[PDB]
Amino acid sequence: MKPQLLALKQFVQTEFEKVDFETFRQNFNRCLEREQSTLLIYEDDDYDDQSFFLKPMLSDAFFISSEVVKQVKSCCQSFYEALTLFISALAITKGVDVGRYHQQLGKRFGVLTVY
Amino acid sequence: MKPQLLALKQFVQTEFEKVDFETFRQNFNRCLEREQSTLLIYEDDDYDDQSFFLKPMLSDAFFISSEVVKQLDLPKGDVKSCCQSFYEALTLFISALAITKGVDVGRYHQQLGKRFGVLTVY
Amino acid sequence: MKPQLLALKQFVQTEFEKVDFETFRQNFNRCLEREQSTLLIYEDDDYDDQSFFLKPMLSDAFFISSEVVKQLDLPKGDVKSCCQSFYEALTLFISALAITKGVDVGRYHQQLGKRFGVLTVY
């Protein structure tokens, strides 16, 4: 078996051994339920799972959030507000200035931005 | 008897009678079937079982995770991709570890990936 | 100066001095020009330049290929067709992927074909 593999397994194993199990187990269980809940996805330290799955679950959860916020300028305000953090991540990621990015989003749509 | 033990019993007992049986029954059978699959221990709402069994299954399943991802063979397989797969399966496990040792999740993950050549979730 | 470095320079320097210059020049100039056209990046004897620059020239060229194969025109291309053209321009590249991770080429190509609606080379 590859040395890098072995040392990594060695590591996660060794680190699991020198930790209080009952505490660990409660923490692992909490992270698990929080992950598998799949609904308030945009606040979930999620993006924990495999990329090809989360990616699609991303587009999925966009449609759903839109469904739940639609009951007109107000509906878009709701959609925007649930994605504030997300939207900032898009800017950090496309090498653009947050603030500028939010503001443009707000101008192009009838939304009041966090910047 | 011991009154406290009594109440605990009275509670889950009463709890059980005031829930739709047939709906409970299915979740129970589903949870069970889920607990007893023995393979994806790391996403398993598991850690339900007793610590003596869980703790060993832990080391057990690691040995197995490592064996199934090390697709270098002697038809080759690079070092990063193999370690990437071992990590991508332990992601949730790794954050808990961090929560548990009072470490900044995120930094924990990042150190992990620097030490071993892995593309981490943080 | 590091003797190993000196030997290394000595070698390419000497190898250069005893080769037909004019034939060398055309070849250098032809490799350099093919290298600098940057767009048909996935068939260029490329992955000649530094890793850090190549790594993102890579991801950047991906984005470009994605916008150059999409002729949806809002008249149309159509999902199936645009992905196919994306897949066929990456055919060799995809094989390098499966080779590198020690996975069976073909099996890899086929999975890619079933995950998306692409007719594969294998």
Please indicate whether, in this complex, the C-beta atoms of A9 and B87 are within 8 angstroms of each other: no
Please indicate whether, in this complex, the C-beta atoms of B69 and A5 are within 8 angstroms of each other: yes
Separation CA C21–CA C27 (nearest Å): 10
A92 at B interface, C-beta within 8 A = no
> Helix, strand, or coil here: B77?
coil
Residues 6+ apart with CB under 8 A from C42: C61, C65, C89, C90, C92, C93
CA C71 to chain centre: 23
B88 at C interface, C-beta within 8 A = no
Using a CB-CB cut-off of 8 Å, the residues of chain B touching A11 are: 112, 115-116
Separation CA C59–CA B47 (nearest Å): 40
Please indicate whether, in this complex, the C-beta atoms of B78 and C103 are within 8 angstroms of each other: no
C96 at B interface, C-beta within 8 A = no
> Helix, strand, or coil here: B93?
helix
> Helix, strand, or coil here: B81?
helix
How many CA atoms lie within 13 Å of A50's alpha carbon, on the beta-carbon side? 7
Please indicate whether, in this complex, the C-beta atoms of A9 and B65 are within 8 angstroms of each other: yes
A100 at B interface, C-beta within 8 A = no
Separation CA B71–CA C44 (nearest Å): 29
Question: In 3D, which of A114, A95, A73, A63 has the Cα closest to residue A104?
Answer: A114
Separation CA B54–CA B47 (nearest Å): 6
C18 at B interface, C-beta within 8 A = no
Separation CA A107–CA A85 (nearest Å): 18
- Inter-axis angle of helices A84-93 and A100-108, nearest 10: 120
A24 at B interface, C-beta within 8 A = yes
A55 at B interface, C-beta within 8 A = no
Question: In 3D, which of A47, C103, A9 has the Cα closest to residue B116?
Answer: A9
Separation CA A42–CA A58 (nearest Å): 9
Q: What chain C residue is nearest to B76 in terms of C-alpha separation?
A: C102
Q: What chain C residue is nearest to B75 in terms of C-alpha separation?
A: C102
Q: Resolution of the coordinates in A?
A: 2.4
Question: In 3D, which of A72, A95, A96, A98 has the Cα closest to residue A83?
Answer: A98
The minimal CB distance from A50 to the residues B70, B88, B94 is found for B88
Delineate the domains of chain B, giving CATH numbers in brackets: 1-38 (1.20.890.20), 39-122 (1.20.120.510)
Alpha-carbon distance C96 to nearest alpha carbon in chain B (angstroms): 12
Size of interface A-B (CB pairs under 8 A): 96
Separation CA B114–CA B47 (nearest Å): 29
Separation CA C35–CA C40 (nearest Å): 10
Alpha-carbon distance B9 to nearest alpha carbon in chain C (angstroms): 50
State how far the alpha carbon of B119 is from the alpha carbons of A54, B70, B82, C70, in Å.
16, 17, 12, 30
Q: What is the DSSP letter of A115?
A: -
> Helix, strand, or coil here: A39?
coil
Question: In 3D, which of A33, A51, A34, A30 has the Cα closest to residue A43?
Answer: A34
- Inter-axis angle of helices C79-89 and C91-100, nearest 10: 60
Using a CB-CB cut-off of 8 Å, the residues of chain C touching B81 are: 100-102
Instruction: Determine phi and psi for A63, rounding to 5 degrees.
Output: -65, -45
Using a CB-CB cut-off of 8 Å, the residues of chain B touching C102 are: 71-73, 75-78, 81
Separation CA B67–CA B40 (nearest Å): 14
Q: Is the dihedral of CA B6, B10, B12, B16 positive or negative?
A: positive
Amino acid (1-letter code) at residue C5: L
